[model samples]
Target chain A: QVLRGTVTDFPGFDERADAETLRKAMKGLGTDEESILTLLTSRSNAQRQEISAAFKTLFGRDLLDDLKSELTGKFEKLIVALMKPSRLYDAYELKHALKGAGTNEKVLTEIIASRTPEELRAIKQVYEEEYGSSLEDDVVGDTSGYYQRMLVVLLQANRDPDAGIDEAQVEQDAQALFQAGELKWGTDEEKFITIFGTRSVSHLRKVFDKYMTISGFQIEETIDRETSGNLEQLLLAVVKSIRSIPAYLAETLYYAMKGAGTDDHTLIRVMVSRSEIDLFNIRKEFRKNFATSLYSMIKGDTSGDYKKALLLLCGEDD
Target chain B: QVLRGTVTDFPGFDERADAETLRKAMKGLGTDEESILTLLTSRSNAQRQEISAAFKTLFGRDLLDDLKSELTGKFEKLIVALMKPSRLYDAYELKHALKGAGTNEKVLTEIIASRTPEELRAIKQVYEEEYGSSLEDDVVGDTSGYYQRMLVVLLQANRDPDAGIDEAQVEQDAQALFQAGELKWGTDEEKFITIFGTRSVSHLRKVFDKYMTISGFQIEETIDRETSGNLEQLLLAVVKSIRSIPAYLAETLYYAMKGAGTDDHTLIRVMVSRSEIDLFNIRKEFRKNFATSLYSMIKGDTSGDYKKALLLLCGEDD
Candidate 1:
């Protein structure tokens, strides 16, 4: 979906435009091509497909044809490729474009900014499917290490694949925290922090009993005793309500931005992904805590492409 | 999308029935009830829909006609209903059934389980079109209060809304909290405790500025400054991770069960509503902070039909 706040409310292209009209306007027949250009180019591959099908079914025409006609050159091609539902079409185009003398930065940008981890995985599979080559090998061939890891994390659709909790392993995990945070003379401060704060939560539940067995103290209390600092206190807060990671993630984004130095990318990214989820809660948390509007904060802290993108997502200032 | 996890393999209905032979058996007979039942009766909705469409395209026959010929009464109606995109069609049927009848529970069960608030809002419009009535209106009439508030929250589809945060309001709400918790000479500790601990992050965020400004301290500091006792102390965790209410909700479901005595109904209700977004984070929060496998915690905790329904919505047994 073209998120609400971004590049929006062009008089010509309303939020709920008929599928065929959208398809036609996207292809480049509209007088307001610039507005159409801004609007149609930003939608996801999945949304493009839906719009295409709905438009064709409703108006007896092709959505992509309109895009192909209206927008030209690299931007047009990328948008047209985005119109494909399965990642296969984009994956093929990516491989085809990459094999050439130059790389399509637009393709990479569109894929990374717009597609979710799940969609990327599909594209990977389809890329592999069509070429009889490994998509991972291609991504590896294309990018390296930390950026790759970050992108991979971004691309990861199913974070919890196994879903089953291992009880023995659970005890061991919590015990590690105990060994680090409470069991020693001075306390392993890093151990206390990392186990609860640094790591993702799924693995954290494993070691509760072991931590209890070793310390004879609640983990929250353990943090209070072993660590003495604002950060340590934050650690305790974290372990105490570690149950609310989405909130943590949201607050992480909120706190990162609410104070002076805004991590604009993180703020925009988090807001984009979360607009449909507990973002309201995050927004609530952000405003409740910071006494600032997430909307106004964005308005103040960001502008132009990034601001528009994030705003479109939040469905405001459009 | 029925969200089956690692559930690739299943028995083939065709192989079980020997479709070629079954088709031949029905060829000469005027009423091949047994063969039709053997062939079509036992398939999963997905399989039946897949075959039904393919059967028409490939064999030039209406799949519903064959199924309806063999079944009767409500069973026949259900079998036919099962033949399309079961969720979409069920949503339609749910709208049909719920209209003017105080939101039919059966329709509510199907549509409510899978929809986000936004989808529900849109579906409400479509439902009204289909039934000449507003689904939201009926749901509002049928339900009452915060329990109804929860339903309203669910149906709104968009919660983050327009948060143009004013620091003044945050200060006021925080003062309200102080009045509830700290400013009171005796400390009306319980209500204050939960507000600081378990209140939705959004509510807290709104009141955050007041909390900080009134005491000349941040809200996180105030938790330490104001309260005592294990539960009171845990309020920091709530404030610290206020953005992560979904995870909190997940824990709510987990606590609703996993011990000797279980809150199974609450578990089912939350699990049903939260599975899409928050539950994933909630599962992580449960495992990390609590060290209890949320799934097994629930699996061990809940029993009978409620457990089955929860497990159905919870995706894989993580």
Candidate 2:
């Protein structure tokens, strides 16, 4: 868990041994097991692996080989290390595969596709080991402007370790959000409501009980207090049932483009990903909100891949 | 590979027979190798396993018992009748898993994500074997409305065995499409030009080459003869290079909102996805066409995840 140890306790303590001598100690030899385990154990699984690959490239022998050669015993065994079938092969995409500069897209892609927030931290650990700087640092160095800042923000967001759910707290927060939006005299909304509505439903559901316990008031009661619009009604329904959000978003998107012009690609990606999730409900919501079916809206507004992906999401024939 | 063949021809088909059956077939019962191989070989790998299970279920005798009682051979010999892993798994999904009124999400997700068009056909083939009805037919019977239609379309999109692709034909088809809007056209001028211009640039490149070869006409020459106006000029540039579609859409969305009321979510999502794919390129093109940056156009349009996703697509914050 020690991310960076104290100066005296820093392994291979000589200051001059810092870069060059440290390189000599580990490179072409084996992993500096103690240093690596300490540096990475505190990180995520992704970080440990990245650091390992980096060690190999920096020193010459594979980082994996280094670990195998230098580190001994079961702890070192796991360190030499276990990797997933997908991830095991993916590690080689760096210094050996087809991306530019130092970014291993295979790693980036796999991480993006599947990693939870904690996993990004691990990737950062590994990126540091390989590059001697944070993944965020390298991303900043390599990418420019808004793209860079957004990625940095996303990475930082993932670093917050999500302790497993506490339903009471979740319920309390839900009520708080509802009160903040609905219980107010004239809608103390904006950030309070926006943040609440945007959160993943699984996380929000836990907060419901807490709301009930703390305020001795149901969230629905508060929501009924303020807003008098269809949008607000939809929001209340969605907040009441996690299942409604996808449908809500779907209805929102349907309304967004059902007139005048098309935003084809977005329509497609959302439907494709959500089809198995909650698109059925989305269709119902779309009908209720706009008096139009999602399919008809798509048919009228978009064509090609946007249409193709969207139809597929609706779980409908092309 | 003959996925369907006789046992004597299939090297070691007898290996899966039970010990008692092997003995009975050799002496008392007599091995009906032809009937067995004819039946087993045509089954998908999943079907073969299912048959094996059914043998135990029906006769109270394991299929492997006969094999162990008689045959000796390599793993390959024993497994030759097995279908490819992908097709075999597809069969499993369409048959045992997807059958009986309850849809299995696991099977659907796996099939959708990984199966090739050819593999989909194989699933259809095996589903018929186990269920005594066309797999597509069953899907229609099992599901309802638009969602069901979508699944059927996907299933039907699986081509026939002779439907294997010819790259040349695809190119030809793409070119024909390009020619319709850009090549030999009526004197609708502005209308013809705008329609041709909206397509993406890379799509246009392949399209133009095909049009030139198949139709013996250059795109612009056709456009000049048949189209007119400033919109025509924009359309010409579009046919010439389509990579700037996002920039174009950005302008379109920005214009939608720039005046007054706007559907901001659509503006955000389209912009975000565009950012990553080629939004920057689109922006450059947008500025050239409209004399304004797409960003400035969408300047105050959206402000959240919808904005973030769009911005990510726009490729600014990477």
DockQ of each: 0.03, 0.01
lDDT of 1 by residue, B1-318 (tens): 112221111264554234343345445564454445434434444666666666666557666686566445533443354354433453465555555564444335334434545566667776777667776776677655333333444455543422333345556557667675455324554445433433333446667755666777776554443345333333443453354554455545555674568654345344533443355556666677777777676568655433443444454645
Query: After superposition on all CA atoms, what RMSD does each candidate show versus the true structure?
Result: 16.8, 26.3
Docking class of 1: incorrect
What local lDDT does model 1 show for residue A140?
A: 54
In candidate 1, stretches whose alpha carbon ends up further than 4 angstroms from where it belongs are: A1-318, B1-119, B122-133, B142-169, B176-242, B258-280, B302-318
- Per-residue error for A288 in candidate 2, Å, reads 6.6
Name the top TM-score candidate: 1
Return the TM-score for candidate 2, rounded to 2 decimals: 0.23
- Local distance difference test, candidate 2: 0.44
Give the top-scoring candidate (DockQ).
Answer: 1
